[PDB]
Amino acid sequence: DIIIATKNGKVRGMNLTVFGGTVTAFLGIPYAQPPLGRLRFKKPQSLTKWSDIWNATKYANSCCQNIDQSFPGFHGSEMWNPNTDLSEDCLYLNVWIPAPKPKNATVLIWIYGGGFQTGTSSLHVYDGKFLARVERVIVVSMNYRVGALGFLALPGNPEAPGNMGLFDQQLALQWVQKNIAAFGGNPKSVTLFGESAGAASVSLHLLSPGSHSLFTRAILQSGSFNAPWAVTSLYEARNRTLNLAKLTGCSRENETEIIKCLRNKDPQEILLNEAFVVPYGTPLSVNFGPTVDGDFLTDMPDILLELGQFKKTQILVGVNKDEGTAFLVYGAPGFSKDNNSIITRKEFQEGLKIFFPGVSEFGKESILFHYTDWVDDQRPENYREALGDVVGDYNFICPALEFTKKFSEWGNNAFFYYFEHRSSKLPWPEWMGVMHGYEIEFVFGLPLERRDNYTKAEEILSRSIVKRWANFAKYGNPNETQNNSTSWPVFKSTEQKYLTLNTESTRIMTKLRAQQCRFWTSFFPKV
């Protein structure tokens, strides 16, 4: 038996067998008053004590959210769908502790992605038990509100001030600060790591004064706040709050009345109209996302980055080789997970109109000009590959590199990775390559299960990544020192060295996508 006394009450965990060892799991501890009723759309409120023993022996409810039903019964999509009951009562977190109980263990706090509209901490690929057993770190992860329930913005008005889900994350970080020592954790050695919107969230915690003292270091997997999809403008946040009001018959005068009207709509009705507040959408469409609210975010984040207004600490940042491909089968004409998706020049151009909705004719022509002058003009995959390269560079690689340049220019050590291994078990077709999201299982050490049909090379890659992430969290330096590994140099603004992650050949390279990112970060934002 294992029972820990926390500031708000006692909680009991459960023992798990992992790799001939033991991990102690506390699944579904609450960290806020459930955001129900008059608390919907507001910032999370503190938790009042409890006298009993909270039973933290199963994952809690996922937050209300729309589900991806584009491929029913397909594991490639459905492995990301919520695996616990949806509910507005979803502000819970999980804690994996090594066994026996550590003394001063470094803490890894996971923030899931999902475009700020979906996601849950209970996904199988976020299972922290492997990291706790292998590296003896504590792993925490939390559920935070998503979609309009998490990011509906009327800027200023405290009934719907925006960024509520970010404040959910922040309140969970406070909980670790006040309670993780009871579990054998070091509140002074806390590393946040996160993928996609989770990584963007981590990047925003770096910017947010209220988060400065809640963590030590930061890891950003395939995401950062300067990604095109990551921050809703206050203009469109307003148009979107108003549009959602009209679709639900909640249009009012007194802006607060709109909120009270939405506070009596059913979660499902809010959810089903969320989709329509933008004209057309893709998973890169982030209808309700982070906003400049004057509270969590005191100014436009691009300005805070430019001017060094952020927490000074080490960062680990990276991207996958084919970030873009996954999104093409959610709208790009002529793509499918079930053919090899040879598209034509005209399908390519149609694809641009979907991924760059309000961009001028000339904007789209400059994209095609830069990406469609080939070596062999006859290679049938030309346009298929270029559209994936366009989406990934624009949405992921160039923002990640831009964030890492600007962040490192203020003196801090930064390490950049380029994840190049396609999972042997990957259920999506070969043409999508090293997909967005499919480094996560290697980070969480799933391939360390020999029982699980991962190749032996994948076990080694995971073992190394896990050691580098842990050493980064413990020591600020993502090196694997024993097994004679390539040393991971710091990313500096002149040489821009980065580390490739693969089963074959761990190489040091420089100036990832130099040509393409000059297009995207220098020229394109003017159009």
Ligand X SMILES: CCN(C)C(=O)Oc1ccc(O)c([C@@H](C)N(C)C)c1
Ligand Y SMILES: CC(=O)N[C@@H]1[C@@H](O)[C@H](O)[C@@H](CO)O[C@H]1O
Catalytic annotation, residues: 196, 323, 436
Q: What is the nearest approach in angstroms of ligand Y to the Cβ of residue 161?
A: 35
User: Given the complex with ligand X, which of 114 and 334 has the nearer CB atom?
Assistant: 114
The three state secondary structure string of 125-189 is: HHCCHHHHHHHCCEEEEECCCCHHHHHCECCCCCCCECCHHHHHHHHHHHHHHHHCCCCCEEEEE
Among 55, 70, 268, 510, binds ligand Y (CB under 6 A): 55
Q: Judged by CB under 6 A, which of 260, 463, 492, 497 binds ligand Y?
A: 463
Which of 104, 268 has the CB closer to ligand Y? Answer: 104
| The length of the chain, given as a count of residues | 527
Residue 283 binding result from ligand X, ligand Y, none, given CB thresholds of 5 to 8 Å by partner type: ligand X
Q: Which residues pair with 24 in a beta bridge?
A: 15, 97
**Residues whose CB is less than 8 angstroms from the CB of residue 104 and which lie 6 or more positions away in sequence, other chains included:** 184, 185, 186, 189
In the complex, the residues that contact ligand X under the rule CB under 6 A are 66-68, 77, 80, 114-115, 117-118, 283, 326-327, 330, 437
CB of 232 to ligand Y, least distance (A): 32
> Binding site annotation covers 114?
yes
Partner interacting with residue 336 (select from ligand Y, ligand X, none; CB below 5-8 Å by kind): ligand Y
Residue 439 is classified by DSSP as T
Residue 61 binds which of ligand X, ligand Y, none (CB < 5-8 A, kind-dependent): none
- Amino acid (one-letter) located at 408: S
Question: Sheet harboring 315-320: ordered strands across?
Answer: 14-18, 21-30, 92-99, 138-142, 105-111, 185-195, 217-221, 315-320, 414-419, 497-501, 508-510
When binding is defined by CB under 6 A, the residue of 339, 424, 453, 522 that contacts ligand Y is 339
* Biggest distance spanned by C-alpha atoms of the chain: 72
Which positions from 81 to 100 touch ligand Y by CB under 6 A, shown as an x/- string? Answer: --------------------
Distance CA 480, CA 486 (A): 8
- Among ligand X, ligand Y, none, residue 327 binds (CB under 5-8 Å by kind): ligand X
Binding mask 251-290 for ligand Y (x = CB under 6 A): ----------------------------------------
Q: Partners of 161 in the beta sheet?
A: 153
Q: Is 436 annotated as contributing to ligand binding?
A: yes
Count of Cβ atoms closer than 10 Å to residue 488 Cβ? 23
DSSP H helices, 159-300, are 164-179, 197-207, 234-247, 255-262, 267-274
Per-residue interface string for the shown chain with ligand Y, residues 478-497, x marking contact by CB under 6 A? --x-xx--------------
- 339 touches which of ligand X, ligand Y, none (CB within 5 to 8 A by kind)? ligand Y
Q: Please state, in angstroms and as integers, the Cα–Cα distance from residue 161 to each residue in 111, 150, 153, 154, 208, following that order.
A: 21, 10, 5, 5, 16
- Of 26 and 116, the one with the shorter C-beta distance to ligand X is 116
Is residue 447 within 8 A of residue 459, CB to CB? The reply is yes
Q: Which C-beta is closer to ligand Y: that of 15 or that of 104?
A: 104
Q: Which of 337, 406, 422, 467 binds ligand Y (CB under 6 A)?
A: 467
In angstroms, how far is CA 287 from the centroid of its own chain? 16
- Of the pair 485, 496, the CB lying nearest ligand Y is at 485
Per-residue DSSP letter, 520: I
Residue 117 or 211: the one with the smaller Cβ distance to ligand X is 117
Cβ at position 490, least distance to ligand X in Å: 30
Per partner kind, with CB cut-offs from 5 to 8 A, the member of ligand X, ligand Y, none near residue 115 is ligand X
Residue 114 interacting partner from ligand Y, ligand X, none (CB closer than 5 to 8 Å by kind): ligand X
Q: CA-CA distance, 395 to 356, in Å (whole number)?
A: 11
The span from the CA of 469 to the CA of 449, in Å, is 18
State yes or no: 110 annotated in a binding site: no
Q: Interface with ligand Y includes 48 (CB under 6 A)?
A: no
Residue with tokens 């559209």: 387
Residue with smaller CB distance to ligand Y, 297 or 386: 386
How do 14-18 and 21-30 pair as beta strands?
antiparallel
Separation between Cα atoms, residue 244 and residue 232, nearest integer Å: 15
Q: Is 421 annotated as a binding residue?
A: no
Tell me which residues in 496-525 interact with ligand Y (CB under 6 A): none
Residue of 16, 39, 261, 342 interacting with ligand Y (CB under 6 A): 342
Q: Residue 436 interacts with ligand Y (CB under 6 A)?
A: no
List phi, psi (to 5°) of 297.
-115, 110
Q: How many residues bind ligand Y (CB under 6 A)?
A: 16
Residue 342 partner contact from ligand Y, ligand X, none using kind-dependent CB cut-offs of 5 to 8 Å: ligand Y
Which residue type is seen at 218?
A: A
Site for ligand Y in 179-218 (CB under 6 A): 186, 188
With binding defined as CB under 6 A, does residue 51 bind ligand Y?
no
Q: Does 103 bind ligand Y (CB under 6 A)?
A: yes
- Binding residue positions for tacrine: 80, 436
Per CB under 6 A, residues contacting ligand Y are: 52, 55, 103-104, 186, 188, 334, 336, 339, 342, 463-464, 467, 480, 482-483
- Binding residue positions for substrate: 114-115
